[PDB]
Design a protein around this nucleic acid. Structure first.
Ligand SMILES: [Mg+2]
Ligand SMILES: [Mg+2]
Ligand SMILES: [Mg+2]
Ligand SMILES: [Mg+2]
Ligand SMILES: [Mg+2]
Length: 224
RNA sequence: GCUGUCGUCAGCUCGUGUCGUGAGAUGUUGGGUUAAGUCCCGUAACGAGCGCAACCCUUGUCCUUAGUUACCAGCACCUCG
């Protein structure tokens, strides 16, 4: 908002200049002291475009999936996708979560009924020898499948925090053919992302800026 | 039908997904660890089956029930078994 919250924290920064993607050359305002700088005055209209798109998609009972698996960004998306509904992923993305949803449906069922088992009133009233194993399986399943426990159907649109690190999700999203929102850094590619956000990554303040923007956008959208 | 052998070695495969024009490949590679494809972590793979392990028999400790044809600590007799 108003070119100052983003200009303050970390948004006007890039990944040096040695590792830059030619297709970002149109978004570079300059390279001060060997580091690329993003043209924020161009980011604002498309940032607001993404905000208004997700806001108008909120009304209509559509589900928006968030992807944030990264160092120091998983917990932010975990807590921030909390409330306002919507699923998320907070740890390693599983290959085939979209193109092979039938298989992961079984894992979802296993997670649900094992959660019921371990929280039925302490069903495991027996030796801890295999109860520890059961709890370990529970936490292992949670750590990768907690965010998508709901949403029996495929998401109508998807949100990304970084496109280089999780290219696989975007690839299979285009293969399924659904809209995608992505934060494209200076060493990334606009290929496969529909609504581009030429923002910044690896800076925390920027990432909660992005995710709060999205979350209160969907809040003001789904009110009806 | 039954049996030997590699070999009681730890391997051999499938569904769905993905990569390749295809034969095919990933799963099943990698860092550790284990008797073991055993387990953990990572990881375009996610799961499953036959194997490994476990359930069977026996051996080593104790407890309950049992005391004849088995036993003899105590009591007595004893021809001293
Ligand atoms: Mg093909
Ligand atoms: Mg193979
Ligand atoms: Mg093999
Ligand atoms: Mg096994
Ligand atoms: Mg065996």
């Amino acid at each position: 908002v108003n070119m100052r919250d983003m200009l303050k924290a970390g948004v006007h920064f890039g990944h040096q200049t040695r590792y830059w993607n030619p297709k970002m050359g149109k978004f570079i305002f300059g390279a001060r002291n060997k580091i690329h700088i993003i043209n924020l005055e161009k980011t604002l209209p498309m940032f607001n475009e993404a905000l208004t798109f997700v806001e108008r998609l909120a009304a209509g009972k559509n589900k928006i999936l968030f992807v944030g698996t990264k160092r120091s960004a998983g917990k932010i998306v975990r807590e921030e996708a909390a409330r306002c509904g919507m699923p998320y992923v907070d740890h390693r993305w599983l290959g085939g979560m979209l193109t092979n949803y039938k298989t992961i449906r079984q894992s979802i069922k296993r997670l649900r009924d094992l959660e019921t088992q371990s929280q039925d009133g302490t069903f495991d009233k027996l030796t801890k020898k295999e109860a520890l194993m059961r709890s370990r399986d529970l936490e292992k399943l949670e750590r990768s499948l907690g965010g998508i426990k709901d949403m029996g159907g495929l998401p109508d649109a998807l949100f990304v925090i970084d496109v280089d690190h999780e290219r696989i999700a975007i690839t299979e999203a285009n293969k399924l053919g659904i809209p995608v929102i992505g934060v494209v850094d200076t060493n990334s590619s606009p290929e496969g992302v529909d609504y581009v956000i030429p923002g910044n990554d690896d800076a925390i303040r920027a990432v909660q800026l992005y995710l709060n923007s999205m979350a209160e956008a969907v809040i003001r959208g789904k009110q009806g």
